Write an enzyme that holds these catalytic residues in place. Structure first.
Site, PDB file in Angstrom:
ATOM      1  N   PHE A  59       0.847  -1.184   0.000  1.00 30.50           N
ATOM      2  CA  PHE A  59       0.000   0.000   0.000  1.00 30.50           C
ATOM      3  C   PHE A  59       0.887   1.239   0.000  1.00 30.50           C
ATOM      4  O   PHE A  59       2.073   1.161   0.336  1.00 30.50           O
ATOM      5  CB  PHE A  59      -0.920  -0.002   1.225  1.00 30.50           C
ATOM      6  N   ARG A  89      -2.632  11.673   5.739  1.00 29.09           N
ATOM      7  CA  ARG A  89      -2.934  10.319   6.188  1.00 29.09           C
ATOM      8  C   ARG A  89      -2.307   9.267   5.280  1.00 29.09           C
ATOM      9  O   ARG A  89      -2.570   9.233   4.075  1.00 29.09           O
ATOM     10  CB  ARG A  89      -4.446  10.094   6.305  1.00 29.09           C
ATOM     11  N   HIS A 103     -11.219  12.962   0.113  1.00 28.03           N
ATOM     12  CA  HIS A 103     -11.353  11.603   0.620  1.00 28.03           C
ATOM     13  C   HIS A 103     -11.416  11.550   2.148  1.00 28.03           C
ATOM     14  O   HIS A 103     -12.408  11.092   2.720  1.00 28.03           O
ATOM     15  CB  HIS A 103     -10.193  10.753   0.098  1.00 28.03           C
ATOM     16  N   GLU A 155      -6.781   2.531  -3.319  1.00 28.71           N
ATOM     17  CA  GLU A 155      -5.333   2.591  -3.516  1.00 28.71           C
ATOM     18  C   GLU A 155      -4.752   1.170  -3.534  1.00 28.71           C
ATOM     19  O   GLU A 155      -3.622   0.953  -3.983  1.00 28.71           O
ATOM     20  CB  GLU A 155      -4.685   3.456  -2.427  1.00 28.71           C
ATOM     21  N   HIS A 164      -7.706  11.787  -2.397  1.00 26.99           N
ATOM     22  CA  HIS A 164      -7.364  10.455  -2.883  1.00 26.99           C
ATOM     23  C   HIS A 164      -7.111  10.521  -4.382  1.00 26.99           C
ATOM     24  O   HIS A 164      -7.958  11.008  -5.133  1.00 26.99           O
ATOM     25  CB  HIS A 164      -8.467   9.441  -2.580  1.00 26.99           C
ATOM     26  N   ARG A 223      -0.282   9.767  -0.466  1.00 24.93           N
ATOM     27  CA  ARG A 223      -1.592  10.236  -0.930  1.00 24.93           C
ATOM     28  C   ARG A 223      -1.535  11.659  -1.488  1.00 24.93           C
ATOM     29  O   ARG A 223      -2.312  12.009  -2.380  1.00 24.93           O
ATOM     30  CB  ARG A 223      -2.613  10.178   0.211  1.00 24.93           C
ATOM     31  N   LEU A 251     -15.001   5.987  -4.918  1.00 20.42           N
ATOM     32  CA  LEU A 251     -13.609   5.604  -4.713  1.00 20.42           C
ATOM     33  C   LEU A 251     -13.225   4.313  -5.425  1.00 20.42           C
ATOM     34  O   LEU A 251     -13.920   3.302  -5.327  1.00 20.42           O
ATOM     35  CB  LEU A 251     -13.264   5.487  -3.223  1.00 20.42           C
ATOM     36  N   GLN A 256      -7.429  15.528   2.705  1.00 19.38           N
ATOM     37  CA  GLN A 256      -6.834  14.498   1.854  1.00 19.38           C
ATOM     38  C   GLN A 256      -7.561  14.346   0.526  1.00 19.38           C
ATOM     39  O   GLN A 256      -8.780  14.169   0.489  1.00 19.38           O
ATOM     40  CB  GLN A 256      -6.758  13.145   2.572  1.00 19.38           C
TER      41      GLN A 256
HETATM   42  C1  LIG Z   1     -14.978   8.020   2.279  1.00 15.25           C
HETATM   43  C2  LIG Z   1     -14.177   6.756   2.284  1.00 15.25           C
HETATM   44  C3  LIG Z   1     -13.302   6.548   3.342  1.00 15.25           C
HETATM   45  C4  LIG Z   1     -12.520   5.397   3.391  1.00 15.25           C
HETATM   46  C5  LIG Z   1     -12.618   4.447   2.378  1.00 15.25           C
HETATM   47  C6  LIG Z   1     -13.499   4.654   1.319  1.00 15.25           C
HETATM   48  C7  LIG Z   1     -14.279   5.807   1.262  1.00 15.25           C
HETATM   49  C8  LIG Z   1     -15.218   6.003   0.103  1.00 15.25           C
HETATM   50  N1  LIG Z   1     -11.841   3.304   2.428  1.00 15.25           N
HETATM   51  C9  LIG Z   1     -10.968   3.093   3.483  1.00 15.25           C
HETATM   52  C10 LIG Z   1     -10.182   1.939   3.543  1.00 15.25           C
HETATM   53  O1  LIG Z   1     -10.257   1.093   2.657  1.00 15.25           O
HETATM   54  N2  LIG Z   1      -9.313   1.742   4.602  1.00 15.25           N
HETATM   55  C11 LIG Z   1      -9.217   2.689   5.607  1.00 15.25           C
HETATM   56  O2  LIG Z   1      -8.451   2.526   6.560  1.00 15.25           O
HETATM   57  N3  LIG Z   1      -9.999   3.827   5.551  1.00 15.25           N
HETATM   58  C12 LIG Z   1     -10.871   4.044   4.496  1.00 15.25           C
HETATM   59  N4  LIG Z   1     -11.643   5.198   4.442  1.00 15.25           N
HETATM   60  C13 LIG Z   1     -11.573   6.220   5.542  1.00 15.25           C
HETATM   61  C14 LIG Z   1     -12.457   5.670   6.672  1.00 15.25           C
HETATM   62  O3  LIG Z   1     -13.396   4.752   6.145  1.00 15.25           O
HETATM   63  C15 LIG Z   1     -13.220   6.729   7.456  1.00 15.25           C
HETATM   64  O4  LIG Z   1     -12.291   7.584   8.075  1.00 15.25           O
HETATM   65  C16 LIG Z   1     -14.100   6.054   8.510  1.00 15.25           C
HETATM   66  O5  LIG Z   1     -15.079   5.269   7.868  1.00 15.25           O
HETATM   67  C17 LIG Z   1     -14.815   7.035   9.429  1.00 15.25           C
HETATM   68  O6  LIG Z   1     -15.505   6.301  10.416  1.00 15.25           O
HETATM   69  P1  LIG Z   1     -16.108   7.005  11.731  1.00 15.25           P
HETATM   70  O7  LIG Z   1     -16.011   6.049  12.894  1.00 15.25           O
HETATM   71  O8  LIG Z   1     -15.380   8.288  12.055  1.00 15.25           O
HETATM   72  O9  LIG Z   1     -17.673   7.264  11.432  1.00 15.25           O
HETATM   73  P2  LIG Z   1     -18.368   7.098   9.982  1.00 15.25           P
HETATM   74  O10 LIG Z   1     -18.012   5.785   9.342  1.00 15.25           O
HETATM   75  O11 LIG Z   1     -18.007   8.237   9.056  1.00 15.25           O
HETATM   76  O12 LIG Z   1     -19.942   7.098  10.317  1.00 15.25           O
HETATM   77  C18 LIG Z   1     -20.572   8.268  10.783  1.00 15.25           C
HETATM   78  C19 LIG Z   1     -21.430   7.930  11.998  1.00 15.25           C
HETATM   79  O13 LIG Z   1     -21.714   9.105  12.737  1.00 15.25           O
HETATM   80  C20 LIG Z   1     -23.108   9.233  12.940  1.00 15.25           C
HETATM   81  N5  LIG Z   1     -23.554  10.632  12.867  1.00 15.25           N
HETATM   82  C21 LIG Z   1     -23.099  11.612  12.023  1.00 15.25           C
HETATM   83  N6  LIG Z   1     -23.779  12.749  12.296  1.00 15.25           N
HETATM   84  C22 LIG Z   1     -24.657  12.505  13.295  1.00 15.25           C
HETATM   85  C23 LIG Z   1     -25.590  13.305  13.951  1.00 15.25           C
HETATM   86  N7  LIG Z   1     -26.033  14.404  13.351  1.00 15.25           N
HETATM   87  N8  LIG Z   1     -26.359  12.752  14.959  1.00 15.25           N
HETATM   88  C24 LIG Z   1     -26.216  11.423  15.315  1.00 15.25           C
HETATM   89  N9  LIG Z   1     -25.290  10.641  14.654  1.00 15.25           N
HETATM   90  C25 LIG Z   1     -24.526  11.173  13.664  1.00 15.25           C
HETATM   91  C26 LIG Z   1     -23.783   8.411  11.860  1.00 15.25           C
HETATM   92  O14 LIG Z   1     -25.000   7.891  12.329  1.00 15.25           O
HETATM   93  C27 LIG Z   1     -22.763   7.327  11.583  1.00 15.25           C
HETATM   94  O15 LIG Z   1     -23.012   6.195  12.385  1.00 15.25           O
END
Ligand SMILES: *Cc1cc2c(cc1C)nc1c(=O)[nH]c(=O)nc-1n2C[C@H](O)[C@H](O)[C@H](O)COP(=O)(O)OP(=O)(O)OC[C@H]1O[C@@H](n2cnc3c(N)ncnc32)[C@H](O)[C@@H]1O
Ligand SMILES: C/C=C/CC/C=C/CC/C=C/CCCCCCC(=O)OC[C@H](COP(=O)(O)OCCN)OC(=O)CCCCCCC/C=C/C/C=C/CCC
Ligand code: HEM
Ligand SMILES: CC(C)Oc1cccc(NC(=O)c2ccccc2C(=O)O)c1
Ligand code: SF4
Ligand code: F3S
Ligand code: FES
Lengths: 239, 102, 138, 613
Positions: free
Chosen positions: D122, D400, D356, D258, D245, D289, D255, D243
């Site tokens: 990676f 990142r 990203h 990578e 991507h 990245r 996406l 970031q």
């Molecule tokens: C965008 C992305 C990121 C990504 C990826 C592919 C894409 C398209 N692939 C990855 C990969 O292969 N390997 C890796 O290590 N990282 C990868 N990423 C980055 C990573 O996935 C993200 O950083 C990560 O998914 C973020 O997770 P996090 O725990 O921070 O939370 P979330 O997945 O984004 O989910 C959001 C949660 O928050 C709740 N929420 C949001 N707003 C509210 C409010 N208003 N009130 C109550 N709850 C809220 C949502 O419900 C959700 O559960």
């Protein structure tokens, strides 16, 4: 200027005496994305912001935008609009499910069923866990392919007629497939008691191989196949 | 945790392969013994078949139990009537034969 | 909150509300495999109704089988019309028999993909007509 | 007033977020015997960690012989020395431990010949502290690592008596005198407002990718907790660091992992030349990245555009065997055909560098404690924690490293669990909330529910998105940043000119997306202003005018008789941003990066140097 017609199900619970009806919208495809969801958001943003629906990834890996498009339970962000402007696209909420509002159904029972099958790795000895990775050969891993991908869109379960007629007591193919997923996982020790969990006429046995679940699946998965595989194990397992 | 539900399913398929086995066997070998076995397998498989429809369709407490009772009476009458027809009449194999060349 | 608890509370909020059931049969698309599922039930019910009516009338209705046939013989029936009654008996029977194997092949696990579902679907449909017409002339 | 039914709940701890980090924090607490409540606007599975593909980094030594300290060096290098090395130590040590846990939890990782977890190459990783070739430590579930992650975390979470508030939009933090008491949230199901109070509050609300017109992230990446922290008056760290991507479909902007480049995929310009062999000689198209995407976006400037528009680049998988593409990358194999209409085995994918990840966010300890900056000194905010993409412990720093966030999720989600468990006890007094608590959270709800504006909500969302997309791209000058700043500033004044249409309690996507617009704008202001202020080229933040990597010392020539530079002179520090909610102005200060590790003997600090792959 290519104009398309969208016939969509509408219901407002915050309006008194309102019952299910259809509202039609018009959209030019030159400014719209290829997919149905692209059009759903387009009229949500520009025409009518009452259209209340579920969405997230617009990638086909959440199961948020799961709805009945043109009489077929698929994802709205994976299905592309019929460029044929002569036909009006009929968009409906997932069949035989309590409509909360405007294409948004109550999936809480479907979710509750997923809890009842217990979709976590169960070992007879959880004392030595968290320290060394469990060994699994590439063959033992191959068995999970086409099963773990289930995104729980619930297009599946609610395209099964048997699930409309037995929503409470019959688990539905989506939930059932995962119960199988956790059976053939070479790591899981609780395969027998997982099969013993299905020992009533309703749990799995409301399947009559209608096969309407597979083929509506937006991920090309085959729940039906896995259900029949459960049934085989159910007779050929001892004690 | 008894496994009556799973065995019930197995019985259904064992009688299905039996019934499929009996139709050509009734043609190739029409006899009294075949008439009774064709009455036994025919009524049992039909009973379990309709039983599946009742459980699928009839939603209710004292509604599902009543229909299951009425089905058992209907089947017990059907099987006994077929038996009576095999003993005090021509018998299915020699009855169908007459019915067809007509 | 348990798994069993969630379901019980699901039914309580929904049944005691003004929430409608989303259209199911009213809107859903038709498929040959699903049409062939309905027909299997239709033929299954009709056949069992025939066997029951045959067994019950053997207990309830007076006379022997030979006298019951001479009752139909004296009904002025032509070959083409007696063939129609003969066809409408084997037609549901042969459907259920052939599709019955299709269900039994399914239970073994073989041929459960969409292609093989429509392939065996037409094969059962054709086998029905060929055995229904083929038997009604014996 | 009284139109809305207030319903107070009582718990030990509240976790906001059901994605990866949030979950691991939620049941991580309940496992420790805590009456925990989880609040999420989506359903757990629908969260954005499901959209993850590449993998989850752990130096298990499952391919070659490996060391978790080699994973430390590569992460701190990738962070462009803006990364807090104490957190990086903690994350790389727990790396193999946290992944083995997950495989035991039920994560169906792809498998090797030996029968172990499948690791792959990676971007940005190395062996022997960056002196021994490419590293293969990216544990993956064959292109669907995130999906499988989020699922097996949720599937395991059902075991514990955690109270999940599914489909609830958290509005603000229930703050009273510095300390946090919980969250006030909208129930989307029936429009009611719930005040959930507890001794602690974990925040894992994910990134804010939807600030831009084009992003890989989902529609529900609106950095809501970032705005929640912002409205409390608490600072936000490194928000200008965004970031991009390198690889993502030219169309909708989905996406393509990578992990394509880690398996052997190549980047091709209009000529057919492997241009990523011209920019980075050693690491090639398996570089950072920031370095890869900036090379890509520069090739477009040079006139090497590939499509019928001359504005995008190519990712070739054509030359790889079909055997490998089916087993290793089937999730992209389908979605490339589904969106771009492209067969992976015969022709390359159209790709474009787009938003990203968000390395910035809520200032965080290595323990996960939320930090406030008062009198130039770090200080712990009582009853408040943050973890994941949402937070900023800056384990990723300025850029990142690929496949680190899903590790960041698990490790630091777990951290918040142990930091609560090993500090206070369950059953301890829940602090008494105000009788009025969160009046203006409701006064915000009622204002937006009946909004009679002259400008539509949806068009203002696009007004913010395209402005960010041009004024704060991969490359940014003080010219476009200054104009962009006063352009975003006006679009904050427009937030009382917005028109809403839906006036219903039950499911008001019109209202919540507008609430997302209030939340996104606060993130946007702090992003763009921090960008114009920062005058250096560090990681993803590259100034065309100030293209220098400004540290305390000039690390090109060895530090000898070289004099140290004062703090308010060099740019090796964290950007802390505040915003007054009424005036819509951003005032920003700075705080030192952590350079020391946790234990120098077991893991030694790696000081700044010339950074190029
Ligand atoms: C965008 C992305 C990121 C990504 C990826 C592919 C894409 C398209 N692939 C990855 C990969 O292969 N390997 C890796 O290590 N990282 C990868 N990423 C980055 C990573 O996935 C993200 O950083 C990560 O998914 C973020 O997770 P996090 O725990 O921070 O939370 P979330 O997945 O984004 O989910 C959001 C949660 O928050 C709740 N929420 C949001 N707003 C509210 C409010 N208003 N009130 C109550 N709850 C809220 C949502 O419900 C959700 O559960
Ligand atoms: C319950 C019963 C109700 C009766 C009504 C149902 C009748 C449908 C039967 C269709 C089968 C065609 C019969 C052909 C025939 O003449 O049998 C052969 C007969 C002439 O010899 P041959 O050797 O053919 O003669 C030489 C002339 N070519 O000799 C036999 O071997 C008789 C065997 C008949 C077995 C069929 C059992 C069907 C039971 C299904 C019940 C469905 C209810 C509706
Ligand atoms: C020899 C040919 C036959 C075979 C191989 C056969 C076997 C089967 C099989 C495998 C099923 C599948 C049940 C399911 O899962 O849906 C079925 C259904 C059924 N069959 Fe038969 N059967 C035959 C003839 C008959 C006859 C002669 C009758 C009664 C006169 C009958 C009555 C029924 C009924 C009532 C059902 C249940 C319908 C449903 O709920 O789908 N079948 N049969
Ligand atoms: C799409 C819709 C119009 O089509 C329909 C309508 C009504 C019933 C059905 N199908 C069944 O009810 C059915 C048929 C055979 C075996 C079992 C069942 C069952 O109840 O599970 C399909
Ligand atoms: S198996 Fe397929 S149709 Fe069923 S819930 Fe999963 S993705 Fe949906
Ligand atoms: S639609 Fe149906 S009854 Fe079984 S094969 Fe599929 S769940
Ligand atoms: S929004 Fe995730 S599948 Fe349509």
């Amino acid at each position: 200027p290519r104009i398309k017609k969208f016939a969509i199900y509408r219901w407002d619970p915050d309006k008194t005496g309102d019952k299910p009806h259809m509202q039609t919208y018009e959209i030019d495809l030159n400014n719209c994305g290829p997919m149905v969801l692209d059009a759903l958001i387009k009229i949500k943003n520009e025409i009518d912001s009452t259209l209340t629906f579920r969405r997230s990834c617009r990638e086909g890996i959440c199961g948020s935008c799961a709805m009945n498009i043109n009489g077929g339970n698929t994802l709205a962000c994976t299905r592309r609009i019929d460029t044929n402007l002569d036909k009006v696209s009929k968009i409906y909420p997932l069949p035989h499910m309590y409509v909360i509002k405007d294409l948004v159904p109550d999936l809480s029972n479907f979710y509750a069923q997923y809890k009842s099958i217990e979709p976590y790795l169960k070992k007879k000895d959880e004392s030595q866990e968290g320290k060394q990775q469990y060994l699994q050969s590439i063959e033992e891993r191959e068995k999970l392919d086409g099963l773990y991908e289930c995104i729980l869109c619930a297009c599946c379960s609610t395209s099964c007629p048997s699930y409309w007629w037995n929503g409470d007591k019959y688990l539905g193919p989506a939930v059932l497939m995962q119960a199988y997923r956790w059976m053939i996982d070479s790591r899981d020790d609780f395969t027998e008691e997982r099969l013993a969990k299905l020992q009533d006429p309703f749990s799995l046995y409301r399947c009559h191989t209608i096969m309407n679940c597979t083929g509506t699946c937006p991920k090309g998965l085959n729940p039906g196949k896995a259900i029949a595989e459960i049934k085989k194990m159910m007779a050929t397992y001892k004690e | 945790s008894s496994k009556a539900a799973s065995l019930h399913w197995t019985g259904e398929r064992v009688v299905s392969v039996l019934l499929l086995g009996l139709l050509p066997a009734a043609y190739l070998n029409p006899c009294s013994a075949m008439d009774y076995s064709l009455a036994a397998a025919l009524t049992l498989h039909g009973h379990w078949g309709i039983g599946q429809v009742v459980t699928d369709y009839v939603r209710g407490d004292a509604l599902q139990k009543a229909a299951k009772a009425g089905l058992l009476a209907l089947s017990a009458f059907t099987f006994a009537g077929l038996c009576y027809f095999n003993y005090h009449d021509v018998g299915i194999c020699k009855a169908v034969a007459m019915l067809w060349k007509l | 909150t348990t798994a069993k608890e969630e379901m019980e509370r699901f039914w309580n909020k929904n049944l005691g509300s003004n929430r409608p059931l989303s259209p199911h049969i009213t809107i859903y698309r038709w498929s040959l495999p699903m049409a062939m599922s309905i027909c299997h039930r239709g033929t299954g019910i009709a056949l069992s109704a025939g066997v029951s009516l045959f067994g019950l009338s053997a207990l309830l209705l007076p006379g022997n089988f030979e006298s019951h046939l001479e009752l139909v013989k004296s009904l002025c029936l032509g070959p083409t019309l007696i063939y129609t009654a003969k066809f409408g008996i084997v037609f549901p029977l042969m459907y259920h028999t052939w599709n019955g194997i299709r269900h039994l092949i399914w239970d073994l696990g073989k041929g459960l993909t969409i292609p093989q579902l429509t392939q065996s679907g037409v094969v059962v449909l054709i086998l029905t007509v060929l055995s229904s017409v083929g038997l009604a002339a014996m | 007033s009284t139109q809305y039914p207030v319903v107070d709940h009582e718990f030990d701890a509240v976790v906001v977020g059901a994605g990866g980090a949030g979950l691991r924090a939620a049941f991580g607490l309940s496992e420790a015997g805590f009456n925990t409540a989880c609040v999420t606007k989506l359903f757990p599975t629908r969260s954005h960690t499901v959209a993850a593909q590449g993998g989850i980094n752990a130096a298990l030594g499952n391919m070659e012989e490996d060391n978790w300290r080699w994973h430390f060096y590569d992460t701190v290098k990738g962070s462009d020395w803006l990364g807090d090395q104490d957190a990086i130590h903690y994350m790389t040590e727990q790396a193999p431990a946290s992944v083995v846990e997950l495989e035991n939890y039920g994560m169906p990782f792809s498998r090797t010949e030996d029968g172990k977890i499948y690791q792959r190459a990676f971007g940005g990783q190395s062996l022997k502290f960056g002196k021994g070739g490419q590293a293969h430590r990216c544990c993956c579930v064959a292109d669907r690592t995130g999906h499988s992650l989020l699922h097996t975390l949720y599937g395991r979470s059902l075991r514990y008596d955690t109270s999940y508030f599914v489909e609830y939009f958290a509005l603000d933090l229930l703050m009273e005198n510095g300390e946090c008491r919980g969250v006030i949230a909208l129930c989307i199901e029936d429009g009611s407002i719930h005040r959930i109070r507890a001794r602690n509050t974990v925040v894992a609300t994910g990134g804010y990718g939807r600030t831009y017109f084009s992003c890989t992230s989902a529609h529900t990446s609106t950095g809501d907790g970032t705005a929640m922290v912002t409205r409390a008056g608490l600072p936000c760290q490194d928000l200008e660091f965004v970031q991009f991507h390198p690889t993502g479909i030219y169309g909708a902007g989905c996406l393509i992992t990578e992990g394509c480049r880690g398996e052997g995929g190549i980047l091709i310009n209009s000529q057919g030349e492997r241009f990523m062999e011209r920019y980075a000689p050693v690491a090639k198209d398996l570089a950072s990245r920031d370095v890869v995407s900036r090379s890509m976006t520069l090739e477009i400037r040079e006139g090497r555009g590939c499509g019928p528009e001359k504005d995008h680049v190519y990712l070739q998988l054509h030359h790889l065997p079909p055997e490998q593409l089916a087993v290793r990358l089937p999730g992209i194999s389908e979605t490339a055909m589904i969106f771009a209409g492209v067969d992976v085995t015969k022709e390359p994918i159209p790709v474009l560098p787009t938003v990203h990840y968000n390395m910035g966010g809520i200032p965080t300890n290595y323990k996960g404690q939320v930090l406030r900056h008062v009198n130039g000194q770090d200080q712990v905010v009582p009853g408040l924690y943050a973890c994941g993409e949402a937070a900023c412990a800056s384990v990723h720093g300025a850029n990142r490293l690929g496949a680190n966030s899903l590790l960041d999720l698990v490790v630091f989600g777990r951290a918040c669990a142990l930091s609560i468990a090993e500090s206070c006890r369950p059953g301890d007094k829940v602090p008494s909330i105000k009788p009025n608590a969160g009046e203006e959270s409701v006064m915000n709800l009622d204002k937006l529910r009946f909004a009679n504006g002259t400008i539509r909500t949806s068009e203002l969302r696009l007004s913010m998105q395209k402005s960010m997309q041009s004024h704060a791209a991969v490359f940014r000058v003080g010219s476009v940043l200054q104009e962009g700043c006063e352009k975003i500033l006006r679009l904050y004044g427009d937030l009382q000119h917005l028109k809403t249409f839906d006036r219903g309690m039950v499911w008001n996507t019109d209202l919540v997306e507008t609430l997302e617009l209030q939340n996104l704008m606060l993130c946007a202001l702090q992003t763009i202003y921090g960008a114009e202020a920062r005058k250096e080229s560090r990681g993803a933040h590259a100034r065309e005018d100030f293209k220098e990597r400004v540290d305390e010392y000039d690390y090109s020539k060895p530090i000898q008789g070289q004099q140290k530079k004062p703090f308010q002179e060099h740019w090796r520090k964290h950007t802390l941003s505040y915003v007054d909610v009424k005036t819509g102005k951003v005032s920003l200060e700075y705080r030192p990066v952590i350079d020391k590790t946790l234990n120098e003997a077991d893991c030694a600090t790696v000081p700044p140097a010339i950074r190029s792959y």
